[model samples]
Structure formats: C-alpha cells, structure tokens
Target: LDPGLQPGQFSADEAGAQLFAQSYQSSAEQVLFQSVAASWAHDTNITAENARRQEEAALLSQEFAEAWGQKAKELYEPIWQQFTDPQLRRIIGAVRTLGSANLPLAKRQQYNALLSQMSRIYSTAKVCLTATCWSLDPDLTNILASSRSYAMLLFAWEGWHNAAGIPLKPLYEDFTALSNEAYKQDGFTDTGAYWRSWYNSPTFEDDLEHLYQQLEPLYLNLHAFVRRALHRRYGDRYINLRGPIPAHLLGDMWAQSWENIYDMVVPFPDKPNLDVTSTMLQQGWQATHMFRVAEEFFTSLELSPMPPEFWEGSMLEKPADGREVVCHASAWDFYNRKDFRIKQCTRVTMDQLSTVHHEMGHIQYYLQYKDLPVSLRRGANPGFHEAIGDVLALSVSTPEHLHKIGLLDRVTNDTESDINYLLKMALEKIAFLPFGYLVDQWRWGVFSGRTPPSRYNFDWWYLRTKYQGICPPVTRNETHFDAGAKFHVPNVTPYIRYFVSFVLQFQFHEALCKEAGYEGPLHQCDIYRSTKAGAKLRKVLRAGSSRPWQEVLKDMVGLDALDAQPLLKYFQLVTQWLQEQNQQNGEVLGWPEYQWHPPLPDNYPEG
Candidate 1:
C-alpha cells in the first residue's frame, strides 16, 4: 500500500487523524485533477480521442477513490466516534468516495458508458421542421423564445421530445438500475437517499417540502396572472384559464422560466424597455466584452479580477471549427488550486451577460478557497456554489445597477415600471422554483421504485402539473420519456441545488443590501462598490466547506436556517400587484384539478 494511504498508519488521536486526512487528500488531488482536466477537454472539443482519454481518467480516479475510501474507513471510523469537535469532524468527513466507486470495474465501465450514451443522444438529437432539422441553440431555442404562433411552439416541443426523449428511455432505465446498485453498496437505501445525504441534514427532504409549501402561495398568484394573460392573447379556445397552462406556450423548452414571453405578459407597455438586448447589440458587445464587463462587476465589489489564464484557457464562445462541443455553461476547478475556467458558448444578450457573471462567481469561489485542503475546497454546500453567482446577478440585473453600468439609459422607479421589473424577475426566478423542485422529485420517485418505468411519463407530468401548474401540450404516454429531454435528467445532475439557490440568492442579496446600508425596497437595493458588503461576502466565500454551512450562514447573514422571508420580502410588491390584478380580472387564484389528454398535432410523426 502507498505510505500515505496505508490502513492503521495514523494514530487514533486527533492530530494524527488530521495529518492522515491531509496526506490522503494531497495524494488523491492529482488523480482527481486528471479526471477533471480530461472531462473539460472532452466538453470543449468533443472528439473521439478526448472522450477516450476522459473515460480512462475517470476509471483511474474511481479506482483510487475506492482504495482511499477503504483506507479512510479503516483508519477514521474510530476517530469519528472519538471526536465531537465540529472542525475535526468536518475535516475527517471530507475524505469520502462516490457511491459508484463501490461497483466492480466492469460494472463501473458499463455505468460510465451508459452516461455517455444518454448524453450523446440528448446533445445530438435534432428537431426537424420540414426539410431541415434544427439544432438546439440559435435555431429551436430562438423559435421557443420569440415565436408567438402556438402551432410552431408545439411543433418544436413535440419534435425535440420525440427525437431526444424516446431514444433515451431504455438507457435511463439501465442507468437507474446500476446507480441504485452502487448506492446500495455504499449503504444508502437508494440513489435518492444518497443524493439527499450531501446536504448533511437529517431533515433535508422535509425541509425542501416545507420551503416549497411556503413559496407555493406566491407561485400560484403569479401563475394565475400569467395564465389569464395567455388566455386573452391565445383566446380561451386553446387556453383554459381555470385549467393548467400549456407548457409549450411558456416560451422555454422546459417552461422552467417564462422570461422569454415577457412581451405578452408585460404589465406596462409604455414603460421603457427593461430588456437590454438591443443596447448590448447596438453597443457592439462581443462575447469577450461581455465577460470583461462581468469581471468588472466583481472587481468593483473588491473581488479579484479574472486571472490571465482564465482569459486564455476559458472557452467563452462556441468554436467555429465545427466541433461537437457541449455548449452548456459550466465552471471548472482543476484542483491544482491555481487553474480555474468556465466553458460556455456565449451569445450577446442580457441573459447571456448575466450568465457570464454567474459563471465568474464560481471562479471567485475557487480563488477564495484555493489554498484550503482538497477536501475543503468547495462551497459550504452544493447550493452555496450555485447561489454565489446568482446572488451577484440579483444586484447586477437591477435597474439601478444596470444604469450604473451604462446598460440602461435611466433607472425607472415608477410603480408601473417597478411592477414590470419585478414581473420580469419573477418570470425567471420565481417561475423556476417549482420546476427545480419537481425535476428531482420525479427522479427521487424513479430511484426509490415508487414510480416504475411503466409510469415514467405519467409520473413526470403528474409532478409538473401538481407543482408547476403546467401540462404537456400533447398527449404523452408510457411510450415516451419526456423527462429525459431535460439536460439535467440525462446528465444525472442533482437539481435541488438550483431550487435551493433560488431561495438562497434572495436571502443573500437582502443581507448584502442591508450591509451596504441601502434602506429602500428590497428589489431596488444594489451592493455595487460597497466594500463593506464585499468584506462580509468575502468572509463567507473564504471559509469554503471548512465549517458547517449553518454556522457560516449565521455568521454572515445572522441567520442559521434557510429562510424564504427574504425572498418573499424581495417580491412583496409584485406579489401584492399580482393578487390585485387577479382579483380585478375575476380570475381564479389557482387551477382546478382536472385530467388532460391533449390531441396530437397533425404533423407529429407516428412511429
């Protein structure tokens, strides 16, 4: 055995256990870095060679991880029982393994292959609009985002689902079976239990349920108002105001966010355009320019600027060389402590510009905690990492901040504009909460065998309608795997972090705004150029996961628990406006429970 990883090599005392952990992490870092770098290479360029290299690197890392897990369990099980110090427990707990590491080498290979295949099906699938098949990005996405025709939206939605979801169903079932086996090997009841364990709270599942319930009232108000607007525009022939909204009409592929349909639902047509897309275009903002502007936001808050390597190493825009890259935006930490990068096929738009800030937030977290031990070099929890950039975005997207940055010509503070601004923000932020909650809700049911393969599509829409107040535009049956069409489902990424971040970002923004000493309404507060607020933020970021998240939260924001009051407080005015508008229109405040079986579009392909 390697000296650093030998069982019983460390004394059972506290100091000895700490040393053992540090040594194990140091040795494990190189293996992990190789895996990350290889994965990054494949995502950026997407060639056969890169994919093979990534696979090999992953297998090697898994093998080392299994061995390290065994040694750590032998050496530290007693130490964990003997110590009660939170810091010591945290440090010892950091040296752990993924559940998949417990699988045999051949099983591990099969599992990885399944993941790759499903991802390929999702990425390469194309929706045909007559003679030409359209890829997702500028083609189908643009149609979904801007097109007002109900038929066109339904065509693209169904086409994408048939092409991506149907082919992915069998593969996903196989993947789920293997994943459950791996989780059981690691002593979890199922894959869902394993995913929930990351939060380090026994009440984590119940906590999510509680938070969703707290926000559901606000969500329902927004839903009813939006549904009424759609009813007027599309007419009651297609839209049933009391019934759930059609998913395809919501202006997003998954209807996860409705920001794209703001024009139809905007409260004030006379208010100055809140969207800065045209200004960005007229100003000739290139992708690089957008990144630099995002960097400037951080620097203004006393955060570090992007490193030279970030500019050189990051893939800020899609390659024009016809490579089949995964264009989903992501931040990468190479684990070498000095190198971090983001991969995004960025476009020049207000949304993409905010995304640049979001990804850079990950870079900031990486920089802040780079010096910590490998095990501690992560967000306090998964949601914390996801929340960091979004917290910045809350401020950056505000009218005050946009005006300060020269994007908006003037800040509009009138009630009409305020309502419009809040509604727009709600379309993106509040609108996403339930979708985020339900994605994992469906997966958890599948993992736990509560929803079998026979009912996969049925269960998916059930959760969507129950939570999102939206239903599929066409009849979906057991023959389809509509859930697999979503990127996170095929990619096997846990989605609750996004749901958690939606709440946390607002909590964080409210706290920071208070620290900046802004006294007006929560929505209008901007923390830009406020070093006092920046200092408080830096303290939280610098700790990484060295301490418990609750402790970190209490220290920074003076609260230890996840609170949605700040979120509710931020959207208070908008919520009030939505309620009044719904009352005046005599619109029902929530949808009625009704079974739906949509008719197939005439153009839908019969297989």
Candidate 2:
C-alpha cells in the first residue's frame, strides 16, 4: 500500500475506480464522497437560482444568500483535509489559492456574507434614463443612443449614473475595504496585485501595456475625427479639438465606448442605417431565436449543436412582471456537464445579438470541456473563454456576413464603404481600448492606497483624460463616486478580460481567416462556413485549463505572445482613410496632451 494515499483519498491515476468501481471501496467511503459532491452542487444550484430570482425581482431577501454562503463554506471547509492524494492535493491547493488566505472559519464566513450582500445590491439596482424622473422602467439603451437633444441626453445619462452609482457608493466603499483586507490577509500586496497575478506570466502586464501603446495611434486618429465631428456639430466652444472630449456627447452613460454616436462620426449619414434591431423587430424575432442565429454560426464551424436543453432551460429574455430579476447576462453550468443555461435580459438589437454570441462562446466552452476531469473544466486563462465567442462575433457581425444573412441590403463594396464600416466597428472596439486600460489602472492605484479616498471621482476623470482624452460633461466632485458608474465596477467583474479579448479576437480572426483559404485584405476576410477553420479552433477551445494559454494560443496563431498586429492589419484601410480625412477636413490628426487644472470652488469638495 502506498503511504502517499490517505485511506479514503484517490488520485487521477485511479481514474473512476474510486468513483465508479466497488473494487477496494466501502459503502461508507463512497457515500461520504458522494455526499460532499452533493453539498457542493446543492449550494451552487441554490446560489445560481437565488441570483436568478433576485435579478428577476425588484428586491430580494438576503436570507437565502446568507444560507447559501454558510452552506458554501461547509462544502469547501473539510475538503482541504479530507483529500490527501497527490492529484487531489494539487487541485485543492490550486482551488484554495484562488480564495482568500486560509482564514479562520468565522472570518471566511463574514467575507462570504459580504460578497453575497454586495452581489444583491448590484443585481437589483435600477436606472431610469428618460425625462420621466418618476419612471421606474429599467431599459435605457435605446434613448441614450438616439436622443436628438444633447441636454435631454445629458439628463438621462446623469440620471442613469445617479440611479446606479449613488445608492451603492457606501456599499462599494465597504466592498473595497473588505476586498483589500482579504488580499492583505492572503499575502498579496493589494486586491489589484492579487488580480494581476491571474495572468500567470511575469511579463503579461508589460505585454498588455505594449499592445495598448501600439494601438494608441489608431485610437487617437479615430478620436481626432470624432472630436472634430462633435465640435463641428455642437460648436467649437463646446468641444476643444486638442482638449478632452465632453463625456455626455459620446452617447454612453460612462462614455466607455462611443458606438452609440456612430451617426455623428460616420462619413455617410444618408446611407440607410444597418439597423439589425429594426429588422429583427420587423421579423418578430424572439430573444431565443435571435440567440439561435448566433448558435448556428458555431454549428457552421462544426463545433456541434448546443443540446436542446440550452434553449428549453435558459431564461432568454426579461420576464414581464413586477418581480425583480438580475437581468445581467450570464452562462450557467448546473453542476452537471450536460445542464447549461444562460440568464439574460435580451432585447431585439444588434448589440444584444452580438452579446448573445458572446454568451454562447462561454456555453460552447462549457460543452466542449464538460467531459474533462473536474479540475480541468475551465478556460486556459480568464481571457480565452471571453475571446472565444467574440472572435467568432467578429465574423458574425461583419457587414458581409450580415448581408448574407439577409439583414443588410447590398451596397458599394468600395474603400469609402469599407471606411464607413471600420469606423462603426472602431467606435465600439478601438474606442474601448483606453477605457478598458484605465478602469483597472485606477483600481490598481486605489488598491495600492496611492489614490486617496477623497480623490475617487477626481482621479477617475484624471485617468480618463490621461489615457482616453475624455472629460465629464460637467465638473465632477468627490461627493460622487463616478468610477462606480459602470456595471463592471459595481459588480466587481474582472475588467482586463475585456481589454485582452478586444485584442485577441482580432488575432484569432486573422489565423482562422488564413486557414479558411482567404487571401484578401484582413478587413475583408470572414471564415464563415470554413470547416478547416472550425476544426482548428476546436483544438484550441477543447484545451480548457489543461495547458498554459500561451501554448494554446500558439497552437492556433503560431505566436507565443498576444499581439496587436492583427488588429492593425485588419484596420489598415481605416488607418489610411482616417489620416486623409483629418488632413482634408482640417482636423487635428491627434489630440494634444492637456493638463488637469486645480479644482474650482464648486467642483472641489469640502472637508
């Protein structure tokens, strides 16, 4: 008998002998092991269901969450000691490393409670984006995108920010304090430093920063034209060419991305808008059907069809009633590999369609890796799962693909039209570059205690202006926590995943295009119906967390490091067009750096 194995413990080499076979196993041991697994599944199911129910309602009881937290602690507490075989030890060690430092049971319980409460607050938060200040209806994307009056737009934008951020400000402050304490206890420098380690490479941070710099010129050029256009329309005094662009005019509540204001920046306003939402509405597309279109794209890739339960079981759209629902889109794996669902408040819009595609990316990953050992059922890295669907989204949302799917009418396939499409894409993708970098940048500074609590909003805008060439429409004070406005901020979602996904999608797109026998310009290539591309992509997705992400990326792209060259290559025409347009239209090619001034009496907060 090997001394390394505990009497009841087992390793991978034993395979399912311990789990499936009766050989050298007793009824009590199997029962205990199965009971532990059941407890784990029970709490997870209840937690997912509780979150779903909470998101579906206007308010939720914290009792269920508290109970779930206690149960969760119970599930994980004894396992560290119960399993001592090498594979079990390694997997448990890894899983343990992901949680806070091995705290006392009571401290761990309190931490878990705080997590549940914070999640509750974020899920039920409501926003009214229209002029009816009394209105409680939460949907706001449409008005923010199409409002003709700038003042009204500003009102809605501010209203949404206030509604979402103000009530949760203290909760967020507490959340921050609690997280920092947990990080310190865990032996990390801070929460930001703790998170930064997830990249699993010494140079990952440096590599990401380098990619951002490479994309800066292209991003700035796009910013230059959008600034000129906004200034031209709203008047030069309203927007200084070389200074920060006013936030409200960007048509997003947080000005994170300016995709909504594509009308203000695109060269052709008269061309019929490629309105996928209207087309979907006209065709009476339900949310599930809309998502099904996204699913079919994967099937076309030979990735296999989602099991019927994916549709039958999912909460695809917002339920019509008074009950509060979390409405935030998430993919769920119900303890069993075969049980999968998506929780989303989907709408009939192009954005929702693309978002559904993104969610399905996660689902496909779940489906692909489900049969793997429990320890290996995760993305190679946090970013790989995120980029999976989005890489495919690049092809699915392309104008050529949209037209092929009968949404867009045939039009001029010229450099001018190409520039038009590129700008539309850039408004979402390129504009996101700096906004993505700065959120974590600010968080890191805050977590390190470099950004004092008194300077929260001020320093937030400081980073915005520094990296993004953006400033708030009105002077902001520390009285408000402006950084808490975005969903990711309040939800504590890992953000750098998005920044990395934006870059890797393009890299993956290029590789898949090449495999599909596409020899055209990178911008024009689409790998739809390319079986070779599909097979190659599957090899990467099937890897799950079994190998290092760099190795998996290299398997597909032949590059050991993430690069921005594919993004630049894909947008080459847009680069040339932007340069010529800037020169021809007499707009500055890029905004000059501007300094942040001392706060005025009103903008400054009192002690």
Candidate 3:
C-alpha cells in the first residue's frame, strides 16, 4: 500500500472493503467453534483441570486460610500503612523460607497463606489493572493486556509460589501504600499523599524519575508480531476474494470472531514484517513439541512423570485406529481447525507443517499417557514440557534441517562457507542469552520501583538496546503507554520464565544428544537430529506433567541445572570449529541476524 504507484498501482477502493470483510470471517468461524468448544470443555475438561486444582488445594487447610487470611489482612493493614519499608524488609527476609519450605509453624503458615491469597489478589488485581487501564486506554491497551492475562495467570500458578508462597503482596502492600497519591482520583486523598511520599523515597524497585519511560507495553509487541498475519490472511482474502456468501457461512462467521481480526493481530500496516499470528502459532506449536519430547523421555525411562493433559495418539487408549481425542484448552489448538476460518490460507507452509507436527506432539503425549493411572500420567516437572519442544524445534533451526525441509539450499558448491554461517548463527544464540536475562531483570527492577512511571518505556527501550545486544531505538506503537505491564510482573504467567527455560532446554538437548551416542557437542545435535534420517529420539514426549522438573532432566540426561557440562560442550565445540572454517577460506553470507556477545572473562571460569 505504501511507496505509491509502483507502476502497477491500482485501487479497487471497492476491493479494500471486500478484504476487510474476509479477515474477520476467519475470526468469526474460530469464535463459533470456540464457543461450542468452550461448552464442551466446560462440561468435561475445565471440570477436570479445576477439579484437579481443587483437589490439590484441599491438602492445604481452608480453615487455615480463612484464619490466616483474617490475621494477615488485619495485621497487614496497620504495618502496610505505618512502616511500609520495614514490612518489605520483613517479607523479603521471609521469601526464602516461604519459597522452599512446608509450613511447620503457625506464623509461617499464616505468612504463606497471606502470600497465596495475595497471588490470587494479583489475579484479581489483573482484573483491576485491566479495568483501570481500560478506563485510561480502553480501545488499544485492553486488547493486548487481556489476551495475555490467561497465560500470565497460568505462570502465576506455577512460578510465583516457587519464589515464595506468593510474590505480589509485598509488592502490593508497599506499592499501594505508595500509590495512594497517584491513585487519588480513585478517591482517598490521604492515601494518595502517603503513596506520593513513599514513592518518592530513593529505592531500587519502585521509583518514578521519568515520565515517557514509564509504560512497559506488551500489546504493541503482539501487534508488532501479528499484524502481518492478519492483513495477509483475512484482509486480503475475505475482503477481496469473497463475494456474497451462502446463509450457513454467514451464520457460522457471525458466532466466531464476529469479524474481528484485531483479536489476534492488528490489521494496520505500519509495523515492519509484523506477523504475530504465525508467532503465536509457531510459539504454541513449539510449546507442544516440548511437551511431547518430555513425555517420551520420562515414561519409557520409568522416571517421574506428569500428564500432558492435551496429547493423545494412536498407541494410547483410543487405539492406533480409533478416532482420537485431544484435550486442548489453548487458543493455539483452536486456531488450527479445518473450518477454523483463517483469513486466506489454503495450504500449509513448511512452518505451518512443523506447527502441526509440534501441536500433535502435545496431543500425542496426552494420548500416550492415558495408558497410565491418571495420577502417574503427569509431567516430571513444569519446565520439562518446554524442554521437549525447544529440543525439537531448535534442531530444525539448523541449515541442514532447513535444506531438508526445502527452506534452504544446502547442497551448495562451497561447503566451508556453509559451516561458517551455521557456526556464527549458533554464536549469536550465545550472545543473546545473557542479554535476555538482563532485560527480564530490568523489567523486574522497574516494578520493584527503582525507576518512576514515566521512565518505564524509556528504560525498556534504552536498556533493551544496551543489554539485549539488538538494541535499536524504534518508536513503539501507542497501545503500550498504559502503566501496567503483564509479561512477568503481575502477569503471574510463565512467559517471563521462557528466558530461563530456553537455556535449560538447550542443556536438555545436549544431554539427549549424548545419550543417543552422537555428540561432540549439543549444537551438533540440532543439525544431526534434523536430517532426513531422524535421530532416534526417546519417548520423552510421553512423560506428562506429574514429576518434578529437575527429576525429569536427571532421568533423561543425567544432569542438573548448575552443571553446564552439556552447555560447555556446545561453546567449546562451536568455537574451535567456527575458527577452523574461517581460517580455511569460506565465503559465508548473512548469518541469522542476531546479537553477538563477547565471551565471559576467562579469569572467572566458575562465573
């Protein structure tokens, strides 16, 4: 649409209207299926997920919670108002105990109970954040924040408790005490004054020195990633390709997305190569693949296992020939249906094919686990599923896999050059891990309030450039200006944990490669496994969500988090091999565009 009149420029102003119609058609179809599916899941699956949650929750006494909640609320109110900083210090001191212990004493359990309630309150606060932010920026911000809320909430269920029984109370009690002034419009002038005073104090976690930098936006990224998929998929097809549809088609579309492509991707064109529909699709699929790998490794090894909850395949209860059922509560599963109404897609691409395989990995895992008692059909740990997917997908990122998949031409005349490109790309992965860590740390720092509201976004972009290795300043879209962010803080979901999980995923890969008897290093596994003759991967994918995460890894790869034996092997192998290729006169073209970090100082080998 831009760079007007590319010689063949022509506007069927009428054509634009038509394309608009089709983009939404897919959405409508999806929503209708989802609505029906929701009823279906509500009847069966939701009951199961929640029932399991409730049953597990029953182990913790409700009598205790009610009593603890009452004590916590009462005692907290006075301390929250009077000596807020002291309260923060007390909680921080308590974090280790609550995070790692089973409450043995009355006071400790009370504290743990307070934190648990606060975790839920954060979920409720999410509702508040959504409501409050929408009151401020409803149209743009709400869409992004709400969509991620579920994922973040799921993360809260897993991670926040691990850090301590809860992570948000000290944040809330102290922040709310400080927020009193800024939130004055909501009432309570006295509260606002107290907040303003508390907020002004010099601190590491919650300060507001800058204005424009304050809003850490997540929605804009969704759009930045998904906009391309929407316009190309629906806008072009339904709007331009569609004519008058029959009655049934209209009826179905009406219930689905009700003609809203923006639910997933912004329809506008300003963002560069923005195609988050694929990002979401790819991400979800990769997630599925990870789950699948974990199942196979754990189940066959007789290791600690958990139920994947979604995966089912021919070999399981339904039988190889039976009509299999997959339990998918996620939107990603819904997006892939035949009648699911993608705006313009007619066939699968290489990437889409991979997603299909990956998602099936999740379904198949669940299916396989069905043979076990429900109690035993769970996952080894939460992170194991992610490890499963990453090991599979990252394997394909290699040029060798790309060529096999027909995405790259690997039978090139220059062998040396090809090797160089692959090695460099691997190094870039080396470069990005710490930067990713820094960015997440920066985010955690912002919420802790060492910086003021105005500086949040500025700090984000600024630090992103400095630490992320790919720091380039770009004006973010408007949807991000709201002060509340959800990727990690308050998000309570596992999105932020991806940074941690990815590193572990690679380590898992290294260990697997060794078990298969083919490893000089782990990065090589990525190339080796992706060949036409697929590596003989274990049944890690069948081990559902039952066992603890670390136990699963130890069972599969015989390693733990602190031991970077597998990771160390990757760097050493890649570094020497990459240097050899460069010296051998190879012509490498643009490698995967990625940030490169200098190696850690050699003096601190332990570091």
Best-fitting candidate, scored by lDDT: 1
- Give the least accurate 10-residue stretch of model 3, judged by summed lDDT: 246-255
| Model 1 poorest 10 in a row by lDDT | 1-10
User: What tens digits encode model 1's per-residue C-alpha lDDT throughout 1-607?
Assistant: 3454343467767777777776777786788788899888888877778778877887887777777677667777655756756776765664544578888989999888888788778877888754978877767888898888888888888888889899999999999999999889767899999888778998998898999999998889989989888888887677887888888989899999888888889999888788888898998899999898888878888989989878889998878886888877899999997788999889888888878888999999999998888888888988999999888888888888889878898776799999999999999999999999999989999999999999999999989899988888888889899999998899999999899999988889988999999999999888888898889899989999988899999988889889999999889899999989889989886668456534555565432
The residue-by-residue lDDT of candidate 2 on 312-431, one tens digit each, is 777776667655555667877654666677877787778778889899999899898877665566787788888988888788767788888878886557766777888888888899
On TM-score, the candidate that comes out on top is 1
Q: List the residue pairs that clash in candidate 1.
A: none
RMSD of 3: 23.0
Count clashing residue pairs per candidate: 0, 10, 95
- The CA lDDT of each predicted structure is 0.85, 0.69, 0.34
lDDT (tens digit, per residue) of candidate 3 on 123-149: 322222323421111222223223233
lDDT of 1 at 465: 91
List ranges where model 2 is wrong by over 4 Å: 1-93, 127-138, 269-275, 589-607
Q: Which of the predicted structures, 2 or 3, would earn the higher TM-score when compared with the native?
A: 2
RMSD values, in order shown: 2.2, 7.0, 23.0
